[PDB]
UniProtKB/Swiss-Prot annotation, chains A, B:
Name used for this protein in its record: Endosomal/lysosomal proton channel TMEM175
Organism lineage string: Eukaryota, Metazoa, Chordata, Craniata, Vertebrata
Function: Proton-activated proton channel that catalyzes proton efflux from endosomes and lysosomes to maintain a steady-state pH. Activated at low pH (under pH 4.6) by luminal side protons: selectively mediates lysosomal proton release from lysosomes, eliciting a proton leak that balances V-ATPase activity to maintain pH homeostasis. Regulation of lumenal pH stability is required for autophagosome-lysosome fusion. Also acts as a potassium channel at higher pH, regulating potassium conductance in endosomes and lysosomes.
Phenotype upon changing R6A: Impaired potassium channel activity
GO cellular component: endosome; endosome membrane; lysosomal membrane; lysosome
Encoding gene per record: TMEM175
Site (Hydrophobic filter residue 3-2): L169
Organism of provenance: Homo sapiens (Human)
Consequence when changing T286W: Abolished interaction with LAMP1 and subsequent inhibition
Amino acid sequence: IQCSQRMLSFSDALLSIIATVMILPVTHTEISPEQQFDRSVQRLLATRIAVYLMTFLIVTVAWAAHTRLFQVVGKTDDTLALLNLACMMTITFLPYTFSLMVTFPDVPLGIFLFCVCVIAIGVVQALIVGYAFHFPHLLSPQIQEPLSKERVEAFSDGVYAIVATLLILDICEDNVPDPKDVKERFSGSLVAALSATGPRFLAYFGSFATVGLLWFAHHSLFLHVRKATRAMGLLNTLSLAFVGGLPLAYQQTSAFARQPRDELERVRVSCTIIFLASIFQLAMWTTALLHQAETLQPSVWFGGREHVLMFAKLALYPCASLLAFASTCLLSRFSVGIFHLMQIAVPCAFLLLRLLVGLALATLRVL
Amino acid sequence: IQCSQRMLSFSDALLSIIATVMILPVTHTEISPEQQFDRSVQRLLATRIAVYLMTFLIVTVAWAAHTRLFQVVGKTDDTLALLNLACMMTITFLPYTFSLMVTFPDVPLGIFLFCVCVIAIGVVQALIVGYAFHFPHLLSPQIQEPLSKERVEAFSDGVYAIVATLLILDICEDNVPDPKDVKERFSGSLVAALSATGPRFLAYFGSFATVGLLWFAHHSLFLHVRKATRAMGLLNTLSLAFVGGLPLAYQQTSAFARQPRDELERVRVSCTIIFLASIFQLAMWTTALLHQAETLQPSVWFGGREHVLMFAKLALYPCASLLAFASTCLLSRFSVGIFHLMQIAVPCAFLLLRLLVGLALATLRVL
Ligand SMILES: [Cs+]
Ligand SMILES: [Cs+]
Ligand SMILES: [Cs+]
Ligand SMILES: [Cs+]
Ligand SMILES: [Cs+]
């Protein structure tokens, strides 16, 4: 009998990466001025977004099934480890089946391959369960539907890390200039290319700050969570699904970004993505507050010491993105400036959150 | 005061992904028949491999510095969490500095940016240390150079997962056919395209099996390790660095693979990569055996119950790849067949390792 922590952690990392890499087809979508007014390319972009969401949810379902299985397994062995590796191999091939299905929906080949993959996952999991029940010592103590917190945490961490890596790869792809381009612009001057590419560098830091602050909010939330209910897990899955779309909002090399579009439209899309990513974390927090005794620690109970702090932590980004979208809709003049100011201000608010909470609550109490 | 497990796990995941994504430039290298005999493209491929190795080692050094720092920190706070996120942001920008340096080595801009990034990492880490020492409660109990095992495990898991994801992405990119291609080959027949693309599907399973079995060996090794010495950490870093090259060996869409080359040369390259990946794990095992009392559990001591099993587990792949290379060099006729037979046999040997060890040792004892 061996400990099963590392095996499940590796499974979580693999599955998170597999679920998050479904956004790449969306990022690489190409639209040009010649095809700007064509309907097919717009419909294709929309369908690709939908496909990304569906594939993310499928991979998440598979991961949850694996977690429920290894909650009963408990202790792993060499045989069970190899069988879990086979199950991971089977799950990883789902992306290819869905790619085939997307390329050829009417043809039944992709459907058959997807069904065969699901059936292989099923038989492998059934073999693992039968092996564990055959040998009592392997099973968990309780045997011999809240999901486990550690698994959810690992999956979320993997998703966020992959998003950040996508951002930095986009920077590495776009910002670097070519020798011929440098020579044509100026007489072999790279300082000038740096001067021309600085805003891109700063936008990268802004995007990474956004992702890191969202992760910080999620981490602070799950630190205070005694138990994670199934509803909280579903809301977390939705939040992660909409977190995977951040590259679509904060990428320059992406063919998606390189299309005829107005600045206000890009700002609106990015704000909507951020709001959708953060509102589901806020919903997790509220749902946990409903059943505070079981799903939360005493500190974050209603009227607790850190309740207001956590509420502000999780409501900072949603309210800010909603304000940015409202400014885009109403003012129509300073929207981009408001969005950039918010991008650079939300970090500062996070760093000084406790002092702001204190001063605000004190001022409201006095008056 | 808050627990620092999840923060460090997220840092490990991010840094592992960042270190492993340095292989992508190598995979996307293009060589054509027109430029087959040109020296520049071959030299470029070699230099890109070297650059990948160097960048991996740099990111690993940064990760090790962070681990040594947070061994003293112990307990994290909101401020320390945000500062660690800033440090991760700074480390993630190293890829871009190195890309600029590669594109323009003679120009000093990339060098200056790299130095500034290192200096920013330094100042952020110094601020974290001063903050922790300013507040005694945050520091670890021991304060108020063996690396931590959990961090190494997480980093290795991330690297392996990213390799597997690269493999599956390569499959998704190449194997899927286009509608026009299907129509030109046959009268709208996708079953025929499947029949033509089957060997690629099977090669994917072979490559994933290779990666998963290497991970299984590493996991079995670290399960029995009481303490991880600095030398073992360095050997693990080298093993991971040479594991990142597996995509170069098991990818079809990669422009690297799409070049004029003989089958025997590809087999030799893949075998060399696998041998280099596994021999360093074997070296970790031997180095730990030297100081068995401190670096190993009683089971794997010399003459232990699981010593022979672990030795076989960690020597299966090195010996097999060496045999495949020797067959390539000597026989020159059935080398590819031997390589494929080995690819599909090593998994079976892993699954039946205990029975083979038993029968072999018994036969040797009797005779
Ligand atoms: Cs974890
Ligand atoms: Cs992870
Ligand atoms: Cs971990
Ligand atoms: Cs990881
Ligand atoms: Cs990628």
